[PDB]
Amino acid sequence: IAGPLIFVEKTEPVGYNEIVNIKMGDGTVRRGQVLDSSADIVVVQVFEIFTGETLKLPASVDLLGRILSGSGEPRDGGPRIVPDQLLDINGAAMNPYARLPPKDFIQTGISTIDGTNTLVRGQKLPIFSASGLPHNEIALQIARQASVPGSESAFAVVFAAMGITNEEAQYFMSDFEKTGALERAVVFLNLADDPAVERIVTPRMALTAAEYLAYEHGMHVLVILTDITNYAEALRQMGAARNEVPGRRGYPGYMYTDLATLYERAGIVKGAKGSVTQIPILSMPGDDITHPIPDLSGYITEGQIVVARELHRKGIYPPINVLPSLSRLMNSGIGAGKTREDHKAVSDQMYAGYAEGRDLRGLVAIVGKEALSERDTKFLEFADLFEDKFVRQGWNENRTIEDTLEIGWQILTHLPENQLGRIDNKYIQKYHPAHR
Amino acid sequence: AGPLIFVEKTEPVGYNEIVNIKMGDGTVRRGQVLDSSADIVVVQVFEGVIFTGETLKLPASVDLLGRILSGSGEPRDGGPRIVPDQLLDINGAAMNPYARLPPKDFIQTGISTIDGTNTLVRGQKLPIFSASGLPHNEIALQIARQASVPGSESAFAVVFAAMGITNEEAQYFMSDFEKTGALERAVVFLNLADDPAVERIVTPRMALTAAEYLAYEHGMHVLVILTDITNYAEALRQMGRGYPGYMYTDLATLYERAGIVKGAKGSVTQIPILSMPGDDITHPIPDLSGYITEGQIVVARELHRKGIYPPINVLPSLSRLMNSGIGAGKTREDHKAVSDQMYAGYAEGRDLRGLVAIVGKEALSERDTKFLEFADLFEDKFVRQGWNENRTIEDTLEIGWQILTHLPENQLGRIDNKYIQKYHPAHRKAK
Numbered sequence: 001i002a003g004p005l006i007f008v009e010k011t012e013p014v015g016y017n018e019i020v021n022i023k024m025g026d027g028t029v030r031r032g033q034v035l036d037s038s039a040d041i042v043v044v045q046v047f048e049i050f051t052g053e054t055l056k057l058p059a060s061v062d063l064l065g066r067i068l069s070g071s072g073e074p075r076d077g078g079p080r081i082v083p084d085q086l087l088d089i090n091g092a093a094m095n096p097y098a099r100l101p102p103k104d105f106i107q108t109g110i111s112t113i114d115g116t117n118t119l120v121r122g123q124k125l126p127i128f129s130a131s132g133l134p135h136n137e138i139a140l141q142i143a144r145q146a147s148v149p150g151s152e153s154a155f156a157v158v159f160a161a162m163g164i165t166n167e168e169a170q171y172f173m174s175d176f177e178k179t180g181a182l183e184r185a186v187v188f189l190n191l192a193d194d195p196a197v198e199r200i201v202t203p204r205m206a207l208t209a210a211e212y213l214a215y216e217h218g219m220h221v222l223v224i225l226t227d228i229t230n231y232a233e234a235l236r237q238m239g240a241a242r243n244e245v246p247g248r249r250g251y252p253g254y255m256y257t258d259l260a261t262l263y264e265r266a267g268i269v270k271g272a273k274g275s276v277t278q279i280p281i282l283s284m285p286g287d288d289i290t291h292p293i294p295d296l297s298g299y300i301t302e303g304q305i306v307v308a309r310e311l312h313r314k315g316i317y318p319p320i321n322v323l324p325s326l327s328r329l330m331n332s333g334i335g336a337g338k339t340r341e342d343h344k345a346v347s348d349q350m351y352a353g354y355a356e357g358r359d360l361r362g363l364v365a366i367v368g369k370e371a372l373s374e375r376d377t378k379f380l381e382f383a384d385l386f387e388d389k390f391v392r393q394g395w396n397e398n399r400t401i402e403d404t405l406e407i408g409w410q411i412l413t414h415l416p417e418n419q420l421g422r423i424d425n426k427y428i429q430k431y432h433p434a435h436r
Numbered sequence: 437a438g439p440l441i442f443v444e445k446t447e448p449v450g451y452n453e454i455v456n457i458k459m460g461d462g463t464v465r466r467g468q469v470l471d472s473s474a475d476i477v478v479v480q481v482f483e484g485v486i487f488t489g490e491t492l493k494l495p496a497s498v499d500l501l502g503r504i505l506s507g508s509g510e511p512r513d514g515g516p517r518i519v520p521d522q523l524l525d526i527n528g529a530a531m532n533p534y535a536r537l538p539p540k541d542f543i544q545t546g547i548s549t550i551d552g553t554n555t556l557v558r559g560q561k562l563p564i565f566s567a568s569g570l571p572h573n574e575i576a577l578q579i580a581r582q583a584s585v586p587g588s589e590s591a592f593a594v595v596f597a598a599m600g601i602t603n604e605e606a607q608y609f610m611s612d613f614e615k616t617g618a619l620e621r622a623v624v625f626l627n628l629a630d631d632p633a634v635e636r637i638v639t640p641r642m643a644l645t646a647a648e649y650l651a652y653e654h655g656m657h658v659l660v661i662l663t664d665i666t667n668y669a670e671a672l673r674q675m676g677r678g679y680p681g682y683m684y685t686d687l688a689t690l691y692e693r694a695g696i697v698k699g700a701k702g703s704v705t706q707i708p709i710l711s712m713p714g715d716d717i718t719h720p721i722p723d724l725s726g727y728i729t730e731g732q733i734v735v736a737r738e739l740h741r742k743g744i745y746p747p748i749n750v751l752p753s754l755s756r757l758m759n760s761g762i763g764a765g766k767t768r769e770d771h772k773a774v775s776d777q778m779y780a781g782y783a784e785g786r787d788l789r790g791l792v793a794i795v796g797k798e799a800l801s802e803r804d805t806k807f808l809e810f811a812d813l814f815e816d817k818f819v820r821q822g823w824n825e826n827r828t829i830e831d832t833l834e835i836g837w838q839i840l841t842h843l844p845e846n847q848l849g850r851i852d853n854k855y856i857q858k859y860h861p862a863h864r865k866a867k
């Protein structure tokens with residue numbers, strides 16, 4: 001009767017496939033079999049230590065301002081968390097999600113996100129990148145800048161790093177402490193050499209903490225997870241998936257729904273007072289042949305933010321290419337009363353102009369700048385202005401959606417007013433710098 | 437430094453030799469010889485007694501249809517050299533047939549996960565995003581065989597270009613096009629892995645040039661399939677340890693060549709295959725995002741591993757111009773609603789697979805079990821289809837309506853009552 005995978009505290013040595021009884025968070029008992037384990041954690045697959053208890057998160061608002069390991073133990077030299085509640089972490093705990101669509105605005109402070117691919121409360125918007133690109137730097141800037149403008153609910157951040165180096169850990173820790181962002185954040189840091197099982201538990205501890213804060217304390221919580229790919233690397237070598245090939249015989253069935261137990265955990269929480277939003281980092285692995293991992297495409301259902309090496313090589317930060325980027329729920333979180341009435345129009349116009357300008361880079365290479373029309377030259381130049389002024393921003397520059405929109409209107413000014421076909425006259429008259 | 441311009445080798449040249457290139461308008465741009473094959477010179481442009489070269493030309497003629505050529509345009513089918521009625525500069529700087537018009541009508545691919553949920557539109561650029569070991573080429577071949585433009589007064593044609601392929605893949609491609617009759621309306625450009633690197637980079641330009649000629653001078657809707665861009669980028673890797681900086685601008689000279697042509701009686705649509713390398717150390721992963729501006733079709737390992745063909749995951753897939761090409765008079769009035777409803781239902785079902793693995797199968801509500809099962813039906817009956825199964829948009833929509841009857845009518849939040857009463861199987865009238 002193979003079923004859900006749970007995590008239980010290890011109190012004694014246990015053997016692979018050992019039958020055990022588990023005392024769950026809700027007080028009920030489960031029958032299961034052991035799959036793998038670390039010094040403090042064992043992975044069990046439920047059916048229907050000999051008699052153990054589930055690994056739990058010491059749920060408490062005191063988690064905020066703390067930096068913990070993947071298993072919830074202090075890394076900041078502080079005392080262990082004094083729990084207000086001990087919650088199971090596999091996702092069965094509170095059943096906090098409402099059947100409501102994601103909808104309001106979350107200000108990341110990054111123009112290429114807030115302006116053209118708006119992140120909304122309850123959404124899961126992955127950052128798609130690759131080795132060598134600054135995705136962690138982007139994840140860190142969002143963590144310290146993110147807020148929920150005009151909201152009556154408090155805002156919190158759950159930052160979860162997986163399989164990182166000592167240097168990286170140092171990097172992250174010092175930043176949260178120096179900026180003060182730590183006061184409104186719970187940080188879970190899993191090192192590359194920490195037990196694999198601990199990496200697997202890391203995203204679950206994070207999400208459980210997120211759900212608790214969102215549901216128990218009516219907060220809008222932003223969960224940043226980096227990097228799924230590293231999570232997937234530990235997963236493929238854990239338990240019964242060990243030395244097994246995906247799609248073949250012997251590959252554990254749970255191996256293909258595992259990522260789903262993570263991306264299913266996002267959304268507005270019951271009561272509609274809080275919510276859990278996810279920003280997972282999906283870094284393209286360069287070893288699909290040697291290290292086959294679970295398909296990560298399942299995490300992409302509401303869009304994605306694309307990090308491009310092209311912009312990175314041009315010396316632009318953050319190197320986000322808005323063209324292949326998308327936020328399917330964007331229309332929920334923008335407009336009058338959320339951002340500003342002209343948000344959709346400006347974003348639409350910048351996208352159109354930037355896409356045109358980029359195509360023109362090809363034409364100019366085909367016929368020469370001397371042969372390009374005046375009109376086309378304007379768009380060609382607009383693409384440069386967009387990348388140089390809108391896309392590019394400092395690592396410590398936190399732009400309000402108003403700043404983002406103004407920069408947008410400023411560069412749009414470079415195009416002929418008669419070429420702004422994506423902006424209704426009403427807005428052109430009201431916000432265009434020439435009629436303002 | 438780029439950009440790259442191809443010139444016919446009319447006289448001996450040397451590396452770094454400064455030369456003048458005769459543009460199709462009588463003017464001349466100057467560059468430097470970067471590399472060259474025996475008949476083609478690759479020049480990098482800037483901005484008497486020196487070489488003045490002619491741009492490499494494509495022997496254009498409707499007689500191109502039904503022919504299998506090499507990346508350089510030479511017969512590979514044993515047939516005679518193409519008798520041109522026009523010599524077209526393959527760099528694209530001689531005609532520019534594109535209209536200032538947005539892509540708009542329907543292109544029926546016959547594949548449900550494309551036509552139904554992320555529709556291909558005439559003049560659009562819709563890449564197939566895949567990876568090593570996946571069947572993107574089989575999907576590409578199927579589209580080439582089945583694609584059409586229902587109700588269009590303009591004829592339809594296919595331009596299929598393969599870069600750096602093996603001899604076995606070539607034979608396999610030539611065989612399919614020939615036995616199905618698909619070759620009858622196609623111009624096939626085949627470049628083999630051993631062919632000079634120079635011929636590999638001219639291949640897509642020869643293809644796009646043939647496409648523009650048919651579309652603009654013969655008022656045809658042309659579908660251009662390029663598989664793949666990664667091999668193309670590999671050829672650029674070393675022409676004169678990642679890819680050269682000019683690659684990004686170079687790729688732009690390819691993706692700018694798409695759209696409705698002047699007169700709006702024709703168009704060029706591109707379906708480039710972008711497969712990610714299975715190994716980065718040797719085959720670094722290039723940034724081909726410049727080609728992705730109108731969406732993409734995602735081939736997913738998950739579906740392939742489950743034994744489903746075509747393994748297309750609609751959730752991450754997207755067609756930004758879909759609304760242009762659907763609805764009454766194009767496909768059917770209920771298209772957008774069925775598409776929205778299936779997408780939402782599939783996404784919900786997939787999330788529930790997550791919940792099932794958290795609380796267990798028997799813990800799911802009856803309602804949730806309904807969606808969980810719909811996800812299975814979607815993959816088993818909508819996604820899955822034969823490699824030779826050409827579905828009309830009607831078949832696709834009807835298959836959609838059938839699996840949707842698994843969901844509670846009160847759950848079809850994406851379909852307004854008017855379409856429910858008219859098309860829902862439980863309400864539709866016999867007629």
Ligand SMILES: Nc1ncnc2c1ncn2[C@@H]1O[C@H](COP(=O)(O)OP(=O)(O)OP(=O)(O)O)[C@@H](O)[C@H]1O
Pocket residue numbers: 128129130131284295296297298300304306307308309310324325565721722723724725728731732734752753
């Ligand atoms: N699981 C997935 N795997 C691959 N591609 C996906 C997946 N899900 C969605 N996509 C699509 O692929 C695109 C991401 O690939 P993209 O071209 O951005 O790579 P990249 O980040 O530019 O690589 P590079 O490291 O060279 O910059 C997105 O536009 C998205 O639409």
Ligand SMILES: NCCc1ccc(S(=O)(=O)F)cc1
Pocket residue numbers: 445447448449450451471472473474
């Ligand atoms: N790698 C070979 C480059 C090359 C090859 C041939 C020439 S010659 O074409 O002018 F006949 C010039 C340069």
